[PDB]
Coordinates of C-alpha atoms and ligand atoms in Angstrom, one line a residue:
Chain Y
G1 CA 37.5 27.9 32.7
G2 CA 36.4 24.3 33.5
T3 CA 32.9 22.7 33.9
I4 CA 30.4 24.3 36.3
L5 CA 27.2 22.2 37.0
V6 CA 24.5 23.5 39.2
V7 CA 22.9 20.6 41.1
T8 CA 19.3 21.3 41.9
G9 CA 16.3 19.1 43.0
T10 CA 12.6 19.0 42.3
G11 CA 12.0 19.5 46.0
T12 CA 13.5 19.3 49.5
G13 CA 14.8 16.0 50.8
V14 CA 15.3 14.4 47.4
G15 CA 19.0 13.6 48.1
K16 CA 20.7 16.6 46.4
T17 CA 23.7 16.3 48.8
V18 CA 24.3 12.5 48.4
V19 CA 24.0 13.0 44.7
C20 CA 26.7 15.8 44.8
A21 CA 28.9 13.4 46.8
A22 CA 28.3 10.5 44.5
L23 CA 29.1 12.5 41.4
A24 CA 32.1 14.0 43.1
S25 CA 33.3 10.6 44.1
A26 CA 32.7 9.2 40.6
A27 CA 34.5 12.1 39.0
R28 CA 37.5 11.9 41.3
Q29 CA 37.9 8.2 40.6
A30 CA 37.8 9.2 36.9
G31 CA 40.8 11.5 37.6
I32 CA 38.8 14.8 37.6
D33 CA 39.5 17.5 40.2
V34 CA 36.3 18.5 42.0
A35 CA 35.2 21.5 43.9
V36 CA 31.7 21.8 45.6
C37 CA 30.1 25.2 46.4
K38 CA 27.1 25.3 48.7
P39 CA 26.6 29.1 48.8
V40 CA 23.7 29.0 51.3
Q41 CA 23.2 26.4 54.0
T42 CA 20.2 26.3 56.3
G43 CA 19.1 24.0 59.1
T44 CA 22.4 24.3 61.0
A45 CA 20.9 24.3 64.5
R46 CA 20.0 20.7 64.0
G47 CA 23.4 20.0 62.5
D48 CA 22.9 20.2 58.7
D49 CA 26.2 20.7 56.9
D50 CA 26.1 19.5 53.3
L51 CA 29.7 20.4 52.5
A52 CA 30.9 18.3 55.4
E53 CA 28.9 15.3 54.1
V54 CA 30.4 15.8 50.7
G55 CA 33.8 15.8 52.4
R56 CA 33.3 12.6 54.4
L57 CA 31.7 10.7 51.5
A58 CA 33.8 11.8 48.6
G59 CA 37.0 13.3 50.0
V60 CA 36.6 16.7 48.3
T61 CA 38.5 19.4 50.0
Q62 CA 37.7 22.5 47.9
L63 CA 34.4 23.0 49.8
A64 CA 33.2 26.7 49.6
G65 CA 30.2 28.3 51.3
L66 CA 29.1 31.8 52.1
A67 CA 26.3 31.7 54.7
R68 CA 24.8 29.4 57.4
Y69 CA 21.4 29.8 58.9
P70 CA 20.2 27.8 62.0
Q71 CA 16.5 27.4 61.1
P72 CA 15.6 24.4 58.9
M73 CA 13.8 26.7 56.4
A74 CA 14.1 28.2 53.0
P75 CA 17.0 30.7 53.0
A76 CA 14.9 33.8 52.6
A77 CA 12.7 32.5 55.5
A78 CA 15.7 31.5 57.6
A79 CA 17.3 34.8 57.0
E80 CA 14.2 36.8 58.0
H81 CA 13.8 34.8 61.2
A82 CA 17.5 35.5 61.9
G83 CA 17.1 39.1 61.1
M84 CA 20.0 39.1 58.5
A85 CA 20.1 39.3 54.8
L86 CA 21.1 36.7 52.3
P87 CA 24.5 37.0 50.4
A88 CA 24.7 39.3 47.4
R89 CA 24.2 37.9 43.9
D90 CA 27.7 39.3 43.3
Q91 CA 29.2 37.2 46.1
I92 CA 27.7 33.9 44.8
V93 CA 28.6 34.4 41.1
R94 CA 32.2 35.5 41.9
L95 CA 32.9 32.7 44.4
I96 CA 31.8 30.2 41.8
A97 CA 33.8 31.9 39.0
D98 CA 36.9 31.8 41.2
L99 CA 36.4 28.1 42.0
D100 CA 36.3 27.2 38.3
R101 CA 39.5 26.3 36.6
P102 CA 40.5 24.1 33.6
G103 CA 40.3 20.4 34.3
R104 CA 38.0 20.9 37.3
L105 CA 34.4 19.9 37.8
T106 CA 32.7 22.5 40.0
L107 CA 29.4 21.5 41.4
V108 CA 27.1 24.3 42.8
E109 CA 24.5 22.8 45.2
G110 CA 21.3 24.8 45.7
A111 CA 19.2 24.8 48.7
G112 CA 15.9 23.0 48.1
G113 CA 14.5 23.5 44.6
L114 CA 15.3 25.6 41.6
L115 CA 13.3 28.7 42.3
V116 CA 14.2 29.2 46.0
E117 CA 15.6 32.7 46.7
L118 CA 19.4 32.3 47.2
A119 CA 20.6 36.0 47.1
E120 CA 19.0 39.4 47.4
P121 CA 16.8 40.5 45.8
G122 CA 15.0 37.4 44.7
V123 CA 17.8 35.8 42.8
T124 CA 17.6 32.0 42.4
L125 CA 19.9 29.2 41.4
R126 CA 18.4 29.6 38.0
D127 CA 19.7 33.1 37.8
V128 CA 23.1 32.0 39.0
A129 CA 23.3 29.2 36.3
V130 CA 22.7 31.8 33.6
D131 CA 25.4 34.1 35.0
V132 CA 28.0 31.4 35.1
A133 CA 26.8 29.5 32.0
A134 CA 26.3 26.3 34.0
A135 CA 24.1 23.4 33.0
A136 CA 21.7 22.0 35.6
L137 CA 21.6 18.5 37.0
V138 CA 18.2 17.7 38.4
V139 CA 17.8 15.4 41.4
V140 CA 14.4 13.7 41.5
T141 CA 12.5 11.0 43.4
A142 CA 11.0 7.9 41.9
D143 CA 7.9 8.5 44.0
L144 CA 4.4 9.4 43.1
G145 CA 4.3 12.9 41.7
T146 CA 7.9 13.0 40.4
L147 CA 6.9 13.3 36.7
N148 CA 5.0 16.6 37.2
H149 CA 7.7 18.2 39.4
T150 CA 10.4 17.1 36.9
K151 CA 8.5 18.4 33.9
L152 CA 7.9 21.7 35.8
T153 CA 11.6 22.1 36.7
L154 CA 12.6 21.3 33.1
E155 CA 10.2 23.9 31.7
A156 CA 11.6 26.5 34.2
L157 CA 15.2 25.6 33.1
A158 CA 14.4 25.9 29.4
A159 CA 12.5 29.2 29.9
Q160 CA 15.8 30.9 30.7
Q161 CA 17.9 28.7 28.3
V162 CA 19.6 26.7 31.0
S163 CA 20.6 23.3 29.6
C164 CA 19.6 20.2 31.5
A165 CA 22.5 17.8 32.1
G166 CA 20.2 15.0 33.1
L167 CA 18.3 13.5 36.0
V168 CA 19.5 11.5 39.0
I169 CA 17.1 9.5 41.2
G170 CA 18.4 10.4 44.6
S171 CA 17.1 7.3 46.3
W172 CA 16.2 4.0 44.5
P173 CA 14.1 1.8 46.8
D174 CA 14.4 -1.9 47.4
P175 CA 12.4 -3.6 46.2
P176 CA 11.4 -0.9 43.7
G177 CA 7.6 -1.1 43.7
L178 CA 5.1 -0.6 40.9
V179 CA 5.2 3.2 41.0
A180 CA 8.9 3.5 41.2
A181 CA 9.5 1.1 38.3
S182 CA 6.9 3.0 36.2
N183 CA 8.4 6.4 37.1
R184 CA 12.0 5.4 36.2
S185 CA 10.9 4.4 32.7
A186 CA 8.8 7.6 32.2
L187 CA 11.6 9.9 33.6
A188 CA 13.9 8.4 31.0
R189 CA 11.4 9.4 28.3
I190 CA 11.7 13.1 29.5
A191 CA 15.5 13.3 30.0
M192 CA 18.7 11.2 30.4
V193 CA 18.7 9.4 33.8
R194 CA 22.3 9.5 34.8
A195 CA 22.0 7.3 37.9
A196 CA 19.7 5.9 40.5
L197 CA 21.3 5.8 43.9
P198 CA 20.4 2.9 46.2
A199 CA 18.4 3.9 49.2
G200 CA 20.6 4.0 52.3
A201 CA 23.7 5.0 50.3
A202 CA 24.2 8.1 52.6
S203 CA 25.0 5.8 55.5
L204 CA 27.9 4.1 53.8
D205 CA 31.5 4.5 54.9
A206 CA 33.8 6.3 52.4
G207 CA 35.1 3.0 50.9
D208 CA 31.7 1.5 50.2
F209 CA 30.3 4.9 49.0
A210 CA 33.2 5.2 46.6
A211 CA 32.5 1.8 45.1
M212 CA 28.7 2.5 44.9
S213 CA 29.4 5.8 43.2
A214 CA 31.7 4.4 40.6
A215 CA 29.1 1.8 39.6
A216 CA 26.2 4.3 39.8
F217 CA 27.2 6.6 36.9
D218 CA 28.3 5.9 33.3
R219 CA 32.1 6.2 33.3
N220 CA 32.2 7.7 29.8
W221 CA 29.6 10.4 30.6
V222 CA 31.4 11.3 33.8
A223 CA 34.8 11.5 31.9
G224 CA 33.2 13.6 29.2
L225 CA 32.0 16.3 31.7
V226 CA 35.4 18.2 31.6
Chain E
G1 CA -21.2 30.0 29.3
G2 CA -20.6 30.4 33.0
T3 CA -17.4 30.4 35.0
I4 CA -15.0 27.4 34.6
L5 CA -12.2 27.0 37.1
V6 CA -9.7 24.2 36.9
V7 CA -8.5 23.1 40.3
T8 CA -4.9 21.9 40.2
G9 CA -2.2 21.4 42.8
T10 CA 1.5 21.6 43.3
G11 CA 1.4 17.9 43.6
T12 CA -0.6 14.9 44.8
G13 CA -1.9 14.7 48.3
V14 CA -2.2 18.5 48.7
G15 CA -6.0 18.5 49.2
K16 CA -7.5 19.3 45.8
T17 CA -10.6 17.3 46.5
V18 CA -11.4 18.9 49.9
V19 CA -10.7 22.3 48.3
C20 CA -13.2 21.4 45.5
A21 CA -15.8 20.5 48.0
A22 CA -15.2 23.6 50.2
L23 CA -15.3 26.0 47.3
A24 CA -18.4 24.2 46.0
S25 CA -20.1 24.4 49.4
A26 CA -19.2 28.2 49.7
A27 CA -20.6 28.9 46.3
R28 CA -23.8 26.9 46.8
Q29 CA -24.3 28.9 50.0
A30 CA -24.0 32.1 48.0
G31 CA -26.8 30.9 45.6
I32 CA -24.5 29.8 42.8
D33 CA -25.3 26.7 40.7
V34 CA -22.2 24.5 41.1
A35 CA -21.0 21.5 39.0
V36 CA -17.9 19.5 39.8
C37 CA -16.1 17.5 37.1
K38 CA -13.2 14.9 37.5
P39 CA -12.2 13.9 34.0
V40 CA -9.6 11.4 35.0
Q41 CA -9.8 9.4 38.3
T42 CA -7.1 6.9 39.2
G43 CA -6.8 4.6 42.2
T44 CA -10.4 3.3 41.9
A45 CA -9.3 -0.2 43.0
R46 CA -8.3 1.1 46.4
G47 CA -11.5 3.0 46.7
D48 CA -10.4 6.4 45.4
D49 CA -13.4 8.4 44.2
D50 CA -13.1 12.2 44.5
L51 CA -16.5 13.0 43.0
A52 CA -18.2 10.9 45.7
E53 CA -16.2 12.7 48.4
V54 CA -17.2 16.0 47.0
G55 CA -20.9 14.9 47.1
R56 CA -20.5 13.6 50.6
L57 CA -18.8 16.6 52.0
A58 CA -20.6 19.4 50.1
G59 CA -23.9 17.9 49.0
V60 CA -23.2 18.4 45.3
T61 CA -25.2 16.1 43.1
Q62 CA -24.1 17.8 39.8
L63 CA -21.0 15.5 39.5
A64 CA -19.5 14.3 36.2
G65 CA -16.7 11.8 35.6
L66 CA -15.1 10.3 32.5
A67 CA -12.1 8.0 32.8
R68 CA -11.5 5.7 35.8
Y69 CA -8.5 3.5 36.3
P70 CA -7.8 1.0 39.1
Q71 CA -4.2 1.5 40.1
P72 CA -3.3 4.6 42.3
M73 CA -0.7 5.9 39.8
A74 CA -0.4 8.7 37.3
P75 CA -3.1 8.3 34.6
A76 CA -0.8 7.1 31.8
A77 CA 0.7 4.3 34.0
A78 CA -2.6 3.5 35.5
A79 CA -4.2 3.2 32.0
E80 CA -1.3 1.1 30.8
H81 CA -1.4 -1.3 33.7
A82 CA -5.1 -1.8 33.0
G83 CA -4.7 -2.4 29.3
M84 CA -6.7 0.8 28.6
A85 CA -6.2 4.1 26.8
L86 CA -6.4 7.7 28.1
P87 CA -9.3 9.7 27.0
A88 CA -9.1 11.9 23.9
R89 CA -8.8 15.6 24.3
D90 CA -12.3 16.3 23.0
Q91 CA -13.8 13.8 25.4
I92 CA -12.5 15.9 28.3
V93 CA -13.4 19.2 26.6
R94 CA -16.9 18.1 25.7
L95 CA -17.5 16.8 29.2
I96 CA -16.7 20.3 30.6
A97 CA -18.5 22.2 27.7
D98 CA -21.7 20.2 28.3
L99 CA -21.6 21.1 32.0
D100 CA -20.9 24.8 31.5
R101 CA -23.8 27.2 31.4
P102 CA -24.6 30.8 32.4
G103 CA -24.9 31.3 36.2
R104 CA -23.0 28.1 36.9
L105 CA -19.6 27.6 38.5
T106 CA -18.0 24.5 37.0
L107 CA -14.9 23.2 38.9
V108 CA -12.7 20.8 37.0
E109 CA -10.6 18.7 39.4
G110 CA -7.2 17.7 38.0
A111 CA -5.3 14.5 38.6
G112 CA -2.1 15.1 40.5
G113 CA -0.2 18.3 39.5
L114 CA -0.6 20.7 36.6
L115 CA 1.6 18.9 34.0
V116 CA 0.2 15.4 34.5
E117 CA -0.7 13.9 31.2
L118 CA -4.5 13.5 31.1
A119 CA -5.1 12.7 27.4
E120 CA -3.1 11.4 24.5
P121 CA -0.7 12.8 23.4
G122 CA 0.8 14.8 26.3
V123 CA -2.4 16.8 26.8
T124 CA -2.4 18.3 30.4
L125 CA -4.9 20.2 32.5
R126 CA -3.1 23.4 31.4
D127 CA -4.0 22.6 27.8
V128 CA -7.6 21.9 28.8
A129 CA -7.7 25.2 30.7
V130 CA -6.6 27.0 27.5
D131 CA -9.2 25.2 25.4
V132 CA -12.1 26.1 27.7
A133 CA -10.8 29.6 28.7
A134 CA -10.7 28.6 32.4
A135 CA -8.6 30.2 35.1
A136 CA -6.7 27.9 37.5
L137 CA -7.1 27.7 41.3
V138 CA -3.8 26.2 42.7
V139 CA -3.9 24.0 45.8
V140 CA -0.7 24.2 47.9
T141 CA 0.7 22.9 51.2
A142 CA 2.2 25.0 54.0
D143 CA 5.2 22.6 54.3
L144 CA 8.9 23.0 53.4
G145 CA 9.2 23.0 49.6
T146 CA 5.8 24.6 48.8
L147 CA 7.3 28.0 47.7
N148 CA 9.4 26.4 44.9
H149 CA 6.5 24.1 43.9
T150 CA 4.1 27.0 43.8
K151 CA 6.4 29.2 41.8
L152 CA 7.1 26.5 39.3
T153 CA 3.3 25.9 38.9
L154 CA 2.5 29.6 38.5
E155 CA 5.3 30.0 35.9
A156 CA 3.9 27.2 33.9
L157 CA 0.4 28.7 34.0
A158 CA 1.7 32.1 32.9
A159 CA 3.7 30.4 30.1
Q160 CA 0.3 29.6 28.4
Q161 CA -1.5 32.7 29.6
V162 CA -3.7 30.7 32.0
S163 CA -4.8 33.1 34.6
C164 CA -4.2 32.1 38.2
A165 CA -7.4 32.5 40.3
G166 CA -5.3 32.3 43.4
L167 CA -3.9 29.8 45.9
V168 CA -5.7 27.7 48.5
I169 CA -3.7 26.0 51.4
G170 CA -5.3 22.6 51.4
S171 CA -4.4 21.9 55.1
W172 CA -3.6 24.5 57.7
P173 CA -2.4 23.4 61.1
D174 CA -3.7 25.0 64.3
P175 CA -1.5 26.1 65.8
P176 CA 0.8 26.9 62.9
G177 CA 4.5 26.3 63.5
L178 CA 7.2 28.7 62.6
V179 CA 7.7 27.1 59.2
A180 CA 4.0 27.0 58.2
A181 CA 3.5 30.6 59.4
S182 CA 6.5 31.7 57.4
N183 CA 5.4 29.9 54.3
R184 CA 1.9 31.3 54.4
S185 CA 3.3 34.9 54.4
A186 CA 5.7 34.1 51.5
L187 CA 2.8 32.4 49.7
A188 CA 0.6 35.5 50.0
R189 CA 3.4 37.7 48.5
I190 CA 3.4 35.3 45.4
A191 CA -0.4 35.3 44.8
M192 CA -3.7 35.9 46.6
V193 CA -4.3 33.2 49.2
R194 CA -8.1 32.6 48.9
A195 CA -8.4 30.2 51.8
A196 CA -6.5 28.0 54.2
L197 CA -8.6 25.0 55.1
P198 CA -8.3 23.7 58.7
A199 CA -6.5 20.4 59.0
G200 CA -9.0 17.6 59.2
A201 CA -11.7 19.4 57.2
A202 CA -12.4 16.1 55.3
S203 CA -13.6 14.6 58.6
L204 CA -16.3 17.2 59.4
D205 CA -20.0 16.3 58.9
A206 CA -22.1 18.1 56.3
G207 CA -23.1 21.0 58.6
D208 CA -19.6 21.5 60.1
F209 CA -18.1 21.3 56.6
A210 CA -20.6 23.8 55.3
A211 CA -19.9 26.2 58.1
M212 CA -16.1 25.7 57.7
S213 CA -16.5 26.4 53.9
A214 CA -18.6 29.6 54.3
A215 CA -15.9 31.0 56.7
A216 CA -12.9 29.9 54.7
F217 CA -13.3 32.1 51.6
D218 CA -14.0 35.8 51.3
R219 CA -17.7 35.9 50.4
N220 CA -17.1 38.8 48.0
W221 CA -14.6 36.7 46.1
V222 CA -16.9 33.7 45.9
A223 CA -19.9 35.8 44.9
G224 CA -17.8 37.5 42.2
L225 CA -16.8 34.3 40.6
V226 CA -20.1 34.0 38.7
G227 CA -22.0 36.9 37.2
Ligands
L6J301 C1 16.4 26.2 51.3 O1 16.0 25.1 50.6 C2 14.8 24.7 51.2 C3 13.6 25.0 50.6 C4 12.4 24.6 51.1 C5 12.4 23.9 52.3 C6 13.6 23.6 52.9 C7 14.8 23.9 52.4 C8 16.1 23.5 53.1 O2 17.0 24.2 53.2 C9 16.3 22.2 53.8 C10 16.1 22.5 55.1 C11 17.5 22.4 55.9 C12 18.3 21.5 54.9 C13 18.0 21.9 53.7 C14 18.3 20.8 52.6 C15 19.8 20.5 52.4 O3 20.7 21.0 53.2 O4 20.2 19.8 51.4 C16 17.8 21.2 51.2 O5 18.5 21.9 50.4 O6 16.6 20.8 50.8
L6J302 C1 -3.2 10.5 38.5 O1 -2.6 11.7 38.8 C2 -1.5 11.5 39.7 C3 -0.3 11.7 39.2 C4 0.8 11.5 40.0 C5 0.6 11.2 41.3 C6 -0.6 11.0 41.8 C7 -1.7 11.1 41.0 C8 -3.2 10.9 41.6 O2 -4.1 11.2 41.0 C9 -3.4 10.2 42.9 C10 -3.2 8.9 42.9 C11 -4.6 8.2 43.3 C12 -5.5 9.4 43.9 C13 -5.1 10.5 43.2 C14 -5.4 11.9 43.8 C15 -6.9 12.1 44.0 O3 -7.8 11.3 43.5 O4 -7.3 13.1 44.6 C16 -5.0 13.1 42.9 O5 -5.7 13.5 42.0 O6 -3.9 13.7 43.2

């Protein structure tokens, strides 16, 4: 086996996908082979496609997914509106296990937050992280309310003995602002802050995004992941 | 004592204050003595004052505060920015204990979400709820992301054996879109939804607000809150 990380977020729209891309880009530039699994993708009718974004921004080609739902809703909700079930727990765990190989960083991107139902019946990304012995990287905001949401997510991880690999602020504003500066310091008291991605980074071309990502993370930490 | 309910939320801006006012108004109209307590208030320099809004919307005069900090931030940062300290645990507990009495419903309004630090060191509303044997009413939104936030908050309450008194949707759109309708159904499968306050409730006058409040909750639930 290699290294499996689940990438979750404290909520929706926190920048999980740009963080997957930035970490993928950083890790490739560190010579690591990277796969990204997005088992469940919703919001396709309006053009959401997180794997494609990871492809454009970081050049990853091992991009695996199982299901795509048009409605911009939580999977269970999108799957009910569509009249079709979610994938099986079995499918998700085994797709991830087959992606994973020595020398490879495999990132598993949830949909929304940690306790959204990903597979039938009621199985979450937390359940999947247990099954594949993955640690969890938590994407957070620097905005008002982030400390509570982060602490809640970390408690939920520890309740099932899922290790936390750190936090990433998905969007760092410019200029920061009083709240954002305060929250960054407080977040670092609760866990390791691996990066804070400049606001607007998702609009970069691949070259600029690759330079941003290399500077965003600690090179030694990245190298140590595998 | 009487009944103590802490009123928390899945985050900030979910409508805890209007929910406190609405439940207070419904209980008063059922003949229940109501006090509302806000042990930590931030944002006072921008005019934030939840107790005064409760009084204005619901007519409550039994209102009790404790700590007030100027900046509209989490209490620890707001207190640091003002060169002040957070209250001690027993200052919060004594405030609640002094209000509590038989026949009375005492609502304790949190600051932000459940695990926000209210007192040194790392004391949260969840700890306070344990100390005063209160159940927790959880205020939620109907928007994308509420299910995860609600489940995280209920799991945290259960981790300390704090009973969940149910959910209240702080702002309910009319008409409800597909997403809000779907989230309300999912929310009700997680826990009892005690009310869904109409959007804009905070702008109703006293009589409209009182009428909205009486219709918002099951009267048998409200009446049963206090023996
Ligand atoms: C399933 O998770 C959710 C939970 C609650 C609310 C919304 C969602 C979403 O799916 C959003 C909506 C479409 C895009 C998705 C987005 C992404 O593609 O990154 C995300 O994961 O938040
Ligand atoms: C202090 O706790 C917090 C922690 C994190 C984020 C926000 C808050 C707030 O308190 C907000 C900020 C000002 C108004 C407050 C509001 C209310 O007065 O109703 C609330 O309590 O959420």
